[PDB]
Swiss-Prot record, chains A, D:
This is Ubiquitin-conjugating enzyme E2 D2. One of its GO terms (cellular component) is nucleus. Keywords: ATP-binding, Nucleotide-binding, Transferase, Ubl conjugation pathway. Interacts with SCF (SKP1-CUL1-F-box protein) E3 ubiquitin ligase complex. Gene3D superfamilies: Ubiquitin Conjugating Enzyme (3.10.110.10). Catalyzes the covalent attachment of ubiquitin to other proteins. Mediates the selective degradation of short-lived and abnormal proteins. Functions in the E6/E6-AP-induced ubiquitination of p53/TP53. GO terms for molecular function: ATP binding; ubiquitin conjugating enzyme activity. Its EC number is 2.3.2.23, 2.3.2.24. It comes from the Eukaryota. The gene is ube2d2. Pfam families: UQ_con. It catalyses: S-ubiquitinyl-[E1 ubiquitin-activating enzyme]-L-cysteine + [E2 ubiquitin-conjugating enzyme]-L-cysteine = [E1 ubiquitin-activating enzyme]-L-cysteine + S-ubiquitinyl-[E2 ubiquitin-conjugating enzyme]-L-cysteine; S-ubiquitinyl-[E1 ubiquitin-activating enzyme]-L-cysteine + [acceptor protein]-L-lysine = [E1 ubiquitin-activating enzyme]-L-cysteine + N(6)-monoubiquitinyl-[acceptor protein]-L-lysine. Belongs to the ubiquitin-conjugating enzyme family. One of its GO terms (biological process) is ubiquitin-dependent protein catabolic process.
Curated annotation (Swiss-Prot), chains B, C:
Auto-ubiquitinated and degraded by the proteasome in apoptotic cells. A zinc finger (RING-type) spans 17-52. It comes from Homo sapiens. It is found in: Cytoplasm; Nucleus. Multi-functional protein which regulates not only caspases and apoptosis, but also modulates inflammatory signaling and immunity, mitogenic kinase signaling and cell proliferation, as well as cell invasion and metastasis. Acts as an E3 ubiquitin-protein ligase regulating NF-kappa-B signaling and regulates both canonical and non-canonical NF-kappa-B signaling by acting in opposite directions: acts as a positive regulator of the canonical pathway and suppresses constitutive activation of non-canonical NF-kappa-B signaling. It is linked to A chromosomal aberration involving BIRC3 is recurrent in low-grade mucosa-associated lymphoid tissue (MALT lymphoma). Translocation t(11;18)(q21;q21) with MALT1. This translocation is found in approximately 50% of cytogenetically abnormal low-grade MALT lymphoma. Highly expressed in fetal lung, and kidney. In the adult, expression is mainly seen in lymphoid tissues, including spleen, thymus and peripheral blood lymphocytes. This is Baculoviral IAP repeat-containing protein 3. Transmembrane segments: none annotated. Interacts with PRSS25; interaction inhibits apoptotic suppressor activity. The BIR motifs region interacts with TNF receptor associated factors 1 and 2 (TRAF1 and TRAF2) to form a heteromeric complex, which is then recruited to the tumor necrosis factor receptor 2 (TNFR2). Interaction with TRAF2 is required for ubiquitination of IKBKE, degradation of NFKBIA and activation of NF-kappa-B. Interacts with RIP1, RIP2, RIP3, RIP4 and USP19. The gene is BIRC3.
Length: 149, 64, 64, 149
């Protein structure tokens, strides 16, 4: 290569040794820059059970720019839009080359477990979430039923 | 500390550059004082990748 | 590089202070640039023990 | 301890793992600061065969001061006096805490293999050595015979 290349090869090669808890990812074709992750809906979120698939796309000048990550799977979460885009700090402003694809998946997981108050990507969902979890989680698990599993 | 391998995988991993993650770390940041990247990765960075403290210089390390 | 142990004995030995040879190295010398002693041993030295270059300062390293 | 203490303990503990080629040393009593080395006259010096014993004494503020080392054994060498003292750069001006007892023994060995022109401790011996090795080595081995073995 490289350099993103020789880097991403380690990334991948490490994600094999020590995969992040809930999921796995990898190259789709021989194009090492186009990845697909599968994330296994985390227990004690309202997404447990269902399985979710995400698309990873490394920029040519990764790790200095953050990778493009977005759910292909349908999902009910205030920080994920109807088109798949994720609303996460590291994915945008807070990204650092120091942090790995492995590490981002994790934070996505934890984001599914704990959505946000200031960030609402979909204001439709956020409001229901704010002080009516009861309702929120029903629709959350309902979608998990319908589209995830 | 658990037997056969590691630290070793881990020990080297603590000592390898944090961005190319290939070359061994060689550069202390000014002023943040992190010894966390190799000579080559440095120029492409404005802020130290660890604490988002902005880099203003480098000291090179000679483990001779 | 030969099997079981080492580098490990040796890897740690490359990373340990050069005078107390107990505590891990933490200090880059100014100006000689050697990262070769731990915080504690430094004060007792006028010249860097490696190249007899005289010490005029220190930078502290944060492997955080 | 320590600190010289905890240091010297490693010194010793390492000199066991990886002893310097020709010799070994260690504490005499429980006084870790009083050591005795035995050095095994190096092959292809005129001292081969014979065995030599040295006395090591660590200063209380070692490693910042060099250890006191001197042959108890008799020896014919321009850089060692009739009383046992060694004339070596590191033993005096060139000492550095960075260097170990192990390392000094080595340089003593190599000093026995290659004496000096500017340093003559015993000018009596140096002159014979200068341009009459023939003669020098005879007396050198002769003493090895008489006192070393
Ligand atoms: Zn690098
Ligand atoms: Zn920093
Ligand atoms: Zn030290
Ligand atoms: Zn130096």
């Amino acid at each position: 290569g490289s350099m993103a290349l020789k880097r991403i090869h380690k990334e991948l090669n490490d994600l094999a040794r020590d995969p992040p808890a809930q999921c796995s990812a990898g190259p789709v074709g021989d194009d090492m820059f186009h990845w697909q992750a599968t994330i296994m809906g985390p227990n004690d979120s309202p997404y447990q059970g269902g399985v979710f698939f995400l698309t990873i796309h490394f920029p040519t000048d990764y790790p200095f720019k953050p990778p493009k990550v977005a759910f292909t799977t349908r999902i009910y979460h205030p920080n994920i839009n109807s088109n798949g885009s994720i609303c996460l700090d590291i994915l945008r402003s807070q990204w650092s080359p120091a942090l790995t694809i492995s590490k981002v998946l994790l934070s996505i997981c934890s984001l599914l477990c704990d959505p946000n108050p200031d960030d609402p990507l979909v204001p439709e969902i956020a409001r229901i979430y704010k002080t009516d979890r009861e309702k929120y989680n029903r629709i959350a698990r309902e979608w998990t039923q319908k589209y995830a599993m | 500390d658990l037997p056969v391998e590691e630290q070793l995988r881990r020990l080297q991993e603590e000592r390898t550059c944090k961005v190319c993650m290939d070359k061994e770390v060689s550069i202390v940041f000014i002023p943040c004082g992190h010894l966390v990247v190799c000579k080559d990765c440095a120029p492409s960075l404005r802020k130290c990748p660890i604490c988002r403290s902005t880099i203003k210089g480098t000291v090179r390390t000679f483990l001779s």
